[PDB]
RNA sequence: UAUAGUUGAAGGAUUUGGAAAAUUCCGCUAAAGAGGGUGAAAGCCCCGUAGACGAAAUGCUGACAACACCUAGGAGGAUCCUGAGUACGGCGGAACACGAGAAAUUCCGUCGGAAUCCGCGGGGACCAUCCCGCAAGGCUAAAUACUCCCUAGUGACCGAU
């Protein structure tokens, strides 16, 4: 998904070397989860990372 | 050396003494030539440019194929041979200015002044004064002093009433005692200078 | 010397060499370059030291050495530099210098023993070659590692 | 400009030295002014409404102000006109012994 | 002070010409001999320049008024506060002149997860003594880069391919 509603994790990109550093491109998406949570008392549905779930 | 003295009519009072370490030095020559060329050739303005192949408002589409027409091969409308193409190795903006060792400057000034005194051309005047800047009197000042050729005037400091009458025929040109340069002496024949300006010169020149 | 009579110092200005202006200069039609070959295109020539194909010299022989991170080299003044401070002046690695003798004391001033001194100075520096102390105390000076 | 429509004038230059007259028309915006009997020119007029015939006519042609003085009338000579602050207008004031135009 | 302005010195004659600013006499002015124009090449014909003066209206920049806001010592050390899924570790990548290399320092993704002044970070793996600092909350003029545009200038820069 796009972002986290609470913090600002977002997708990005970096290379990927393999045993002879042939450089290509990759994607690093942040772990994300859809959960129903309270906002103003109105339960929403939104993306929250699995690192702000403690 | 020794030089005579006059005021504007009071003619031939006692003389004046000047040291031999500055005004008697049997001038070197190559220094003078080189300092003249440098000083003068430091007055340029390098502002001049020219468009070249990648700057002309042209295009990179070939005229036509590489073959077929039997014609010669061409890469771009705009290019050196075509009329209306870029230039190869045209003039760009540059600098032209450059300095010398610090000693030869002083040797040059000393040599110039010693040369001019060597032929009785420094005329030491006592003191010039004008209440108002009346141009006509200046002419009479020189007429009394018998200086008609191209001349140069050295003044002490802001006694401007003696400079505001130096927009004469260009036979004269005015300058204080802090800006005496090489050219502004070599270019002239006779030189006028008050008595205080002489000492002031003999200060800055150590 | 007057404006309209300038003369440069003789033999002090050459002329130029503009190449490729006609077969009489001697440098037209291949601009003093000869026939074909990659020495004769625009911007030809190989990099420096390259050698065709041979393994060049700098790879034919081995690497050696390292560099101590904290070496200290001094600013040696031998013995005759001292021989102008006639008799008693407290030579010092300081405003002694201040005379056009030794600027940029690298890591303190050394003193050496070449080649002959006849004075009675008093020397203060940061090291001494064993023969130098003998020369100083031979003419009867002093020393101090200060 | 220093020259008006009705103002007698001496001519200094150009084949009409010393000859005077009356300025007829004034063309500023190109600095041309025409006088009487100074710039006669022959026009091969073609048969027209005006002058049904085609006579060779004679009219005057413009002259540049650098060829025109002004006149004294109080005296009768030429003055390198200067300006004075007479009462609240700028009436031209002659040089050469103080006239008033 | 920027945007309209005002004032501003001194020449006649002669020879060639279609035409003089040209030539030859004799004069004059300059704090003004920079330049442009006029029937050919002008210090004294014209526009100007050196100077001197000038704004009803509008804008900017100062200054000092008024108002707004902000800021106090000394002595005590019983107890309290000093930025948390943060620092940091493994893993995979990037940033530092530093391509994992013996690799400190800085970030990013994932998992694991500290102490609280007798405390914590750093001084190029790591440990000990010493020394220097207090992260995980914000703001901050000047010295620097550029010129579509306006004003005034300059050029051993071009002169209809």
């Amino acid at each position: 998904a796009k972002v986290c509603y609470f913090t600002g994790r977002k997708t990005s990109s970096g290379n990927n070397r393999s045993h002879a550093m042939n450089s290509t491109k990759r994607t690093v998406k942040p772990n994300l989860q859809k959960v129903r949570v309270l906002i103003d008392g109105k339960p929403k549905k939104v993306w929250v990372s699995a690192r702000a779930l403690k | 050396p020794n030089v005579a003295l006059f005021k504007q009519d009071g003619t031939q009072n006692g003389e004046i003494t000047l040291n031999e370490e500055i005004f008697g030095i049997e001038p070197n020559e190559s220094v003078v030539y080189d300092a003249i060329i440098m000083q003068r050739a430091s007055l340029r303005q390098g502002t001049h440019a020219v468009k070249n192949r990648s700057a002309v408002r042209g295009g990179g589409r070939k005229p036509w194929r590489q073959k077929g027409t039997g014609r010669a091969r061409q890469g771009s409308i705009r290019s050196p041979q075509w009329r209306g193409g870029g230039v190869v190795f045209g003039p760009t903006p540059r600098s032209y200015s450059y300095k010398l060792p610090k000693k030869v400057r002083r040797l040059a000034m000393k040599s110039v002044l010693s040369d001019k005194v060597a032929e009785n051309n420094l005329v030491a005047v006592e003191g010039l004064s004008f209440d108002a800047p009346k141009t006509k009197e200046f002419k009479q000042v020189l007429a009394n002093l018998s200086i008609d050729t191209k001349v140069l005037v050295v003044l002490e400091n802001g006694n401007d009433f003696a400079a505001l009458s130096a927009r004469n025929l260009p036979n004269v040109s005015v300058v204080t005692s802090d800006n005496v340069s090489v050219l502004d002496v070599v270019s002239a024949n006779k030189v006028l200078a008050t008595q205080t300006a002489l000492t002031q010169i003999e200060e800055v020149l150590a | 010397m007057k404006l309209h009579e300038l003369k440069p110092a003789e033999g002090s200005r050459q002329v130029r060499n503009r190449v490729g202006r006609g077969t009489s200069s001697g440098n037209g039609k291949t601009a003093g370059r000869g026939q074909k070959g990659q020495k004769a295109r625009s911007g030809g020539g190989v990099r420096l030291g390259f050698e065709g194909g041979q393994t060049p010299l700098f790879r034919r022989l081995p690497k050696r050495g390292f560099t101590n991170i904290n070496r200290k080299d001094y600013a040696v003044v031998n013995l005759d530099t001292l021989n102008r401070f006639e008799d008693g002046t407290e030579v010092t690695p300081v405003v002694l210098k201040e005379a056009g003798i030794v600027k940029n004391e690298k890591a303190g001033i050394k003193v050496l023993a070449d080649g002959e001194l006849t004075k009675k100075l008093t020397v203060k520096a940061a090291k001494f070659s064993k023969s130098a102390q003998e020369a100083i105390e031979a003419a009867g000076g002093s020393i101090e590692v200060i | 400009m220093f020259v008006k429509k009705g103002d007698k004038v001496k001519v200094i230059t150009g084949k009409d030295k010393n000859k005077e007259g009356v300025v007829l028309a004034a063309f500023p915006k190109q600095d041309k002014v025409i006088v009487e009997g100074v710039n006669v020119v022959k026009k091969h007029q073609k048969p027209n409404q005006a002058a049904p015939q085609g006579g060779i006519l004679e009219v005057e042609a413009p002259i540049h102000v650098s060829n025109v003085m002004v006149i004294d009338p109080s005296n009768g000579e030429a003055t390198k006109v200067a300006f004075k602050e007479v009462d609240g207008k700028k009436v031209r004031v002659s040089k050469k012994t103080g006239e008033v135009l």
Side-chain angles (χ1 to χ4, degrees), chain B residues 40 44-45 47 83 133 135 164 167-169:
Chain B
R40 198 179 90 79
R44 281 209 195 196
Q45 256 204 22
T47 90
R83 103 189 271 261
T135 326
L164 270 282
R167 285 81 164 286
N168 220 144
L169 269 193

Side-chain angles (χ1 to χ4, degrees), chain D residues 2-3 5 11 16 18 20 30-33 35 38-39 41 53-55 57 60 68 72-74 82-83 86 88 97:
Chain D
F2 71 87
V3 182
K5 45 191 191 70
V11 171
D16 290 67
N18 328 285
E20 323 173 350
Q30 55 271 9
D31 316 6
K32 293 191 173 171
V33 150
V35 229
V38 300
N39 214 348
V41 179
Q53 303 174 352
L57 291 208
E60 307 76 10
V68 151
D72 294 0
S74 64
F83 292 64
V86 199
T97 69

Side-chain angles (χ1 to χ4, degrees), chain D residues 23-87:
Chain D
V23 165
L24 288 183
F27 309 141
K29 180 62 66 174
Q30 55 271 9
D31 316 6
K32 293 191 173 171
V33 150
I34 305 195
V35 229
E36 288 195 6
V38 300
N39 214 348
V40 154
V41 179
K42 297 167 185 156
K43 281 171 191 153
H44 296 296
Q45 260 305 324
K46 318 172 184 187
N48 193 37
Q49 314 175 6
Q53 303 174 352
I56 289 193
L57 291 208
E58 286 208 345
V59 211
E60 307 76 10
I63 334 177
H64 203 230
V65 184
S66 161
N67 312 258
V68 151
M69 284 295 314
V70 210
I71 293 199
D72 294 0
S74 64
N75 304 12
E77 279 197 36
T79 55
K80 320 182 183 183
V81 181
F83 292 64
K84 236 68 170 190
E85 29 108 352
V86 199
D87 50 318

